Structure formats: structure tokens, C-alpha cells
């Protein structure tokens, strides 16, 4: 490894991230698995598990194992490096923690918030009241209908 | 007056151009909302 | 086979109808915007096709 | 469902900030001798201990 190597027994990368952020303390790292009725399971990677929360961590080419900390450009002018989490009811998708809440990795990373102020978020579970959201898609069609009319 | 009718007609032509530009913007609104 | 061919004919008929409607609502954008373009659909903006 | 599996370290399982490496090499060279500077970087061995 081009960098100096210390085993994950000390967990100094999670220590650095969390303590410098000042949010939580050290927690173990486990492999992630997809428990499902059909039984399919693909291994995203050895990621950290802090209590209930699960933060993505990946192994680099040189064998380096680092937390998937997204370096997203923020409104302060400096690329804020924030550790990421899981998103969706599946939990397969990787999402970025910005402003204290979860967001999808679509837009806001890599450019200042002066361009895009708010980022789209992914619900932590299946989206609320699906029948009413079909009704809401029809309401979107009705808003386009009002504009068209 | 000659200049009065002249500039009234030129302003009418300019208003025709602007109103038709807004009408074409509305037609493009219709097309984009169709999409 | 008969159901498959009927489905093919039905989707072809609907596609032809949609193509006719799209060509009938044809428009051309003009940058000056002085007047409506010559290549305009007669039933453009009408409630009929929509 | 998201399930956790316990597994051993894959390789050395390094970290990001780690222990300071300049002082690491300096301490490694601080044992003594005329010249003890290490070519490359300093790693861990099993036979030595």
C-alpha cells in the first residue's frame, strides 16, 4: 500500500471520521448480506456497522480497506468528506449523508450547492402509501393537464 | 402627421413580432408539455 | 399464431394512428418569431387530437 | 433484509490516517548502527515476530 498500513483492529479510519465529525465512536466491520425470501445474496463489501446504522466500506486495489466516504462539494467552497450509508428498503443502494440527512448519490456531489441547493433523497423503506402515490402520479398528470388546458 | 402614423405602424409591426414570438413560445410550451 | 398476428396488426394500427396524429400536429420553430411558420399543423392546440 | 456476517481481516486490512510514518521509520532507524535507513516502507513480518 502506498500509504502506511495499520490493521482494522484499531479502526483508526472510523475513529478519525466519526470523532472528527463528533457523532459516534468505534464500531466493528462486518460483511453485508441480503437476507431475502428467495435467498439471493450478493456481497457489496466489508462495511462498518455502527449500532443499527450501516456505513459502506470498500477494499481498494492495493488491498486498502477504507470507509466509502463521499467527497461531495459543499456550499462552503471545500469538498466535504462524509461517510456514506445504505438507502432504500432493499439496502443495496449506497447513499450520501449530507446536512445531517440521507440523500441519493445522483447530483449534489462534485459541485457547489450554489448550483443545486437541494438534493433528491431516497426513502429508507418502500415509499409511503403506494395507492395514494399512484393517485399522486395521476395528480401530476392532472397538473400537466391544467397547464395544457 | 406622417411621423405619427409611421411610428405607430412600426410599433404595430414590432408588437406583432413580439406577440408572435410569445405565441411561438407558447407552442413550444405545448410541445415540451406534450413530451 | 392467430393471436400473435392479431396483436401485431393491432399494434401496427395504433402506431400508424399515433404517427398520423404526430405529423398532423407538426410545428416548426422560428428564431425571429415575427409570424407563424408555414409548416404548421392545422389542428395544433385543438382539443380534438389531445 | 440487511444481515451482518462476521469475517476475519482480508489481508493486513489497513486504514486511512494510520500511525505517523516518518516517525515510524525514524524509530525503526533509532536502534543503532552506522547506517540503518530502510529502503522503501516498513511492514510487518511473522517469522521475526
Coordinates of C-alpha atoms in Angstrom, one line a residue:
Chain A
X1 CA 0.0 0.0 0.0
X2 CA 1.3 3.4 -0.9
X3 CA 0.0 4.6 2.5
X4 CA 1.2 3.5 5.9
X5 CA -0.8 0.4 7.0
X6 CA -2.4 -0.2 10.3
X7 CA -4.8 -3.2 10.8
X8 CA -8.5 -2.6 11.3
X9 CA -8.2 -3.9 14.9
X10 CA -7.6 -0.3 16.0
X11 CA -10.2 1.0 13.4
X12 CA -8.4 4.4 13.2
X13 CA -10.2 5.4 10.0
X14 CA -13.6 5.0 11.5
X15 CA -12.2 6.7 14.7
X16 CA -10.9 9.6 12.6
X17 CA -14.2 10.1 10.6
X18 CA -16.6 9.8 13.5
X19 CA -14.6 11.5 16.2
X20 CA -13.6 14.4 14.0
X21 CA -17.2 14.7 13.0
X22 CA -18.1 14.1 16.6
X23 CA -21.1 11.9 16.1
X24 CA -20.4 8.3 17.4
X25 CA -17.5 6.1 18.4
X26 CA -15.7 2.9 17.3
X27 CA -17.7 0.0 15.9
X28 CA -16.9 -3.3 14.2
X29 CA -16.8 -4.0 10.5
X30 CA -18.8 -6.9 9.0
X31 CA -19.7 -8.3 5.6
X32 CA -23.1 -7.2 4.3
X33 CA -25.6 -9.8 3.1
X34 CA -29.0 -9.8 1.5
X35 CA -31.5 -11.8 3.5
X36 CA -34.5 -12.5 1.3
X37 CA -37.3 -15.0 0.8
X38 CA -35.8 -16.1 -2.5
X39 CA -32.4 -16.3 -0.8
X40 CA -30.3 -14.3 -3.3
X41 CA -27.4 -12.5 -1.7
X42 CA -24.5 -10.5 -3.3
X43 CA -21.7 -9.1 -1.2
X44 CA -21.2 -5.4 -1.6
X45 CA -18.2 -5.4 0.6
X46 CA -16.8 -5.4 4.2
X47 CA -18.6 -2.4 5.6
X48 CA -18.8 -0.8 9.1
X49 CA -21.8 -1.4 11.3
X50 CA -22.4 1.3 13.9
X51 CA -25.3 0.1 16.0
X52 CA -28.3 -0.1 13.8
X53 CA -26.7 2.2 11.2
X54 CA -24.5 0.5 8.5
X55 CA -21.9 2.6 6.6
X56 CA -20.4 1.4 3.4
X57 CA -16.7 0.5 3.3
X58 CA -14.8 -0.9 0.3
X59 CA -11.4 -2.5 -0.3
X60 CA -9.1 -0.7 -2.7
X61 CA -6.9 -2.2 -5.5
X62 CA -3.8 -2.2 -3.3
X63 CA -5.6 -4.1 -0.6
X64 CA -6.6 -0.8 1.3
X65 CA -9.9 -1.1 3.1
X66 CA -11.5 2.3 3.6
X67 CA -14.9 3.6 4.5
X68 CA -16.8 4.8 1.4
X69 CA -16.5 8.4 2.4
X70 CA -18.0 10.5 -0.4
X71 CA -16.1 13.8 -1.1
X72 CA -19.0 15.9 -2.1
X73 CA -18.5 19.6 -3.0
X74 CA -20.5 21.7 -0.5
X75 CA -21.6 25.3 -0.2
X76 CA -18.6 26.2 1.9
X77 CA -16.3 26.0 -1.1
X78 CA -14.5 22.9 0.1
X79 CA -15.3 19.3 -0.7
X80 CA -16.8 17.9 2.5
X81 CA -15.8 14.2 3.0
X82 CA -18.8 12.5 4.7
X83 CA -19.1 8.7 5.2
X84 CA -22.0 7.1 3.4
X85 CA -24.9 4.8 4.3
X86 CA -27.4 2.5 2.8
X87 CA -30.6 3.6 1.1
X88 CA -33.9 2.2 0.2
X89 CA -35.9 -0.7 1.6
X90 CA -33.5 -3.1 -0.2
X91 CA -30.5 -1.5 1.4
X92 CA -28.4 -2.4 -1.7
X93 CA -28.1 1.2 -2.9
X94 CA -25.4 3.5 -1.5
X95 CA -26.5 7.0 -0.3
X96 CA -24.6 10.0 0.9
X97 CA -25.2 11.7 4.3
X98 CA -25.4 15.5 3.7
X99 CA -26.7 18.2 6.0
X100 CA -27.5 15.6 8.7
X101 CA -29.8 13.5 6.5
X102 CA -29.6 10.9 3.7
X103 CA -29.6 11.7 0.0
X104 CA -29.3 9.8 -3.2
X105 CA -25.9 9.9 -4.9
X106 CA -27.3 11.5 -8.1
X107 CA -26.5 15.2 -8.3
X108 CA -25.1 17.2 -5.5
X109 CA -21.7 15.5 -5.2
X110 CA -18.9 17.1 -7.2
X111 CA -20.3 20.6 -7.5
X112 CA -21.1 23.5 -5.2
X113 CA -24.6 23.8 -3.7
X114 CA -24.8 27.3 -5.3
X115 CA -25.8 25.5 -8.5
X116 CA -28.0 22.8 -7.0
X117 CA -29.2 23.8 -3.4
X118 CA -31.2 20.7 -2.6
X119 CA -30.5 17.1 -3.5
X120 CA -33.0 14.3 -4.1
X121 CA -33.3 11.8 -1.3
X122 CA -34.2 8.1 -1.3
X123 CA -36.7 6.8 1.2
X124 CA -35.3 4.4 3.8
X125 CA -38.1 1.9 3.0
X126 CA -40.9 1.4 0.5
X127 CA -42.4 4.7 -0.4
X128 CA -45.4 5.8 1.8
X129 CA -48.9 4.8 0.9
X130 CA -48.4 3.4 -2.6
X131 CA -52.1 3.7 -3.7
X132 CA -52.1 7.4 -2.8
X133 CA -48.8 7.8 -4.8
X134 CA -50.5 6.3 -7.8
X135 CA -53.1 8.9 -7.1
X136 CA -50.3 11.5 -6.9
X137 CA -48.9 10.4 -10.2
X138 CA -52.4 10.9 -11.6
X139 CA -52.4 14.3 -9.8
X140 CA -49.1 15.1 -11.6
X141 CA -50.8 14.2 -14.9
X142 CA -53.7 16.4 -13.8
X143 CA -51.3 19.3 -13.1
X144 CA -49.8 18.9 -16.6
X145 CA -53.5 18.8 -17.8
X146 CA -54.2 22.1 -16.0
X147 CA -51.1 23.6 -17.6
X148 CA -52.1 22.2 -21.0
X149 CA -55.7 23.4 -20.8
Chain B
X1 CA -49.0 63.5 -39.0
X2 CA -46.7 61.5 -41.3
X3 CA -44.3 60.6 -38.5
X4 CA -47.1 59.8 -36.1
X5 CA -48.6 57.2 -38.4
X6 CA -45.2 56.0 -39.4
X7 CA -44.0 55.2 -35.9
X8 CA -47.4 53.9 -34.9
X9 CA -47.2 51.4 -37.8
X10 CA -43.6 50.5 -36.9
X11 CA -44.6 49.9 -33.3
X12 CA -47.5 47.8 -34.5
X13 CA -45.1 45.7 -36.5
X14 CA -42.8 45.3 -33.5
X15 CA -45.7 44.3 -31.4
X16 CA -46.7 41.8 -34.0
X17 CA -43.2 40.3 -33.8
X18 CA -43.2 40.2 -30.0
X19 CA -46.7 38.8 -29.7
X20 CA -45.9 36.1 -32.3
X21 CA -42.7 35.3 -30.5
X22 CA -44.7 34.8 -27.3
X23 CA -47.2 32.7 -29.3
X24 CA -44.3 30.5 -30.6
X25 CA -43.0 30.3 -27.1
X26 CA -46.5 29.0 -26.1
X27 CA -46.5 26.5 -29.0
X28 CA -43.1 25.3 -27.7
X29 CA -44.6 25.1 -24.2
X30 CA -47.3 22.9 -25.7
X31 CA -44.7 20.7 -27.4
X32 CA -42.5 20.3 -24.3
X33 CA -45.6 19.6 -22.2
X34 CA -46.6 17.0 -24.7
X35 CA -43.2 15.4 -24.1
Chain C
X1 CA -50.2 -17.9 -34.2
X2 CA -53.5 -16.2 -34.9
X3 CA -53.4 -14.2 -31.6
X4 CA -49.8 -13.2 -32.3
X5 CA -50.7 -11.9 -35.8
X6 CA -53.8 -10.1 -34.4
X7 CA -51.6 -8.4 -31.8
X8 CA -49.0 -7.4 -34.4
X9 CA -51.8 -5.9 -36.6
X10 CA -53.3 -4.1 -33.6
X11 CA -50.0 -2.5 -32.5
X12 CA -49.2 -1.5 -36.1
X13 CA -52.6 0.1 -36.4
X14 CA -52.1 2.1 -33.2
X15 CA -48.6 3.1 -34.2
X16 CA -49.9 4.3 -37.6
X17 CA -52.6 6.3 -35.8
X18 CA -50.0 7.9 -33.5
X19 CA -47.8 8.7 -36.4
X20 CA -50.7 10.4 -38.3
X21 CA -51.6 12.4 -35.2
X22 CA -47.9 13.4 -34.6
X23 CA -47.5 14.5 -38.3
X24 CA -50.8 16.3 -38.1
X25 CA -49.7 18.3 -35.1
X26 CA -46.4 19.3 -36.8
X27 CA -44.7 22.5 -35.9
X28 CA -41.5 24.4 -36.8
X29 CA -39.7 26.8 -34.5
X30 CA -38.6 30.2 -36.0
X31 CA -36.0 32.2 -34.2
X32 CA -37.2 35.7 -35.3
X33 CA -40.8 34.8 -34.3
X34 CA -42.3 37.6 -36.5
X35 CA -45.1 35.3 -37.7
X36 CA -46.2 31.7 -37.5
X37 CA -44.2 29.3 -39.6
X38 CA -45.6 27.9 -42.8
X39 CA -45.1 24.2 -41.7
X40 CA -47.8 24.2 -39.0
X41 CA -50.4 21.6 -38.2
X42 CA -54.0 22.8 -38.9
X43 CA -55.3 21.1 -35.8
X44 CA -52.5 22.3 -33.5
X45 CA -53.6 23.1 -30.0
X46 CA -57.1 21.8 -30.7
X47 CA -58.8 19.7 -28.1
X48 CA -59.6 17.0 -30.8
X49 CA -56.2 15.2 -31.0
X50 CA -55.4 15.7 -27.4
Chain D
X1 CA -33.3 -7.6 4.9
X2 CA -29.7 -6.5 5.6
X3 CA -27.7 -9.1 7.5
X4 CA -24.2 -8.9 9.0
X5 CA -21.6 -11.6 8.6
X6 CA -18.6 -11.8 10.9
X7 CA -15.4 -12.4 8.9
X8 CA -11.6 -12.2 9.6
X9 CA -9.4 -9.4 8.2
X10 CA -8.8 -9.7 4.4
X11 CA -5.0 -9.1 4.3
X12 CA -3.5 -6.6 6.6
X13 CA -6.7 -4.6 6.5
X14 CA -5.1 -1.2 6.5
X15 CA -6.6 2.2 7.5
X16 CA -6.6 5.8 6.3
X17 CA -4.8 8.1 8.8
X18 CA -2.8 5.3 10.5
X19 CA 0.3 5.8 12.7
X20 CA 2.7 8.5 11.6
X21 CA 5.2 7.0 9.1
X22 CA 8.1 9.5 9.2
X23 CA 8.5 8.9 13.0
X24 CA 7.8 5.2 12.3
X25 CA 10.8 5.0 10.1
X26 CA 12.8 7.2 12.4
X27 CA 12.1 4.9 15.4
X28 CA 13.0 1.9 13.2
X29 CA 16.3 3.5 12.4
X30 CA 16.8 4.6 16.0
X31 CA 18.1 1.1 17.2
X32 CA 21.6 1.9 16.3
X33 CA 24.4 1.1 13.8
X34 CA 26.3 3.2 11.3
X35 CA 23.5 3.1 8.7
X36 CA 20.1 1.6 9.3
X37 CA 17.9 3.5 6.9
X38 CA 15.2 1.3 5.3
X39 CA 14.7 1.0 1.6
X40 CA 11.1 1.5 0.8
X41 CA 8.5 1.4 3.5
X42 CA 8.4 -0.6 6.8
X43 CA 6.0 -3.5 7.1
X44 CA 5.2 -6.4 9.4
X45 CA 6.6 -10.0 9.5
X46 CA 5.7 -13.2 11.2
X47 CA 8.9 -15.2 11.4
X48 CA 10.7 -12.3 13.2
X49 CA 7.7 -11.7 15.5

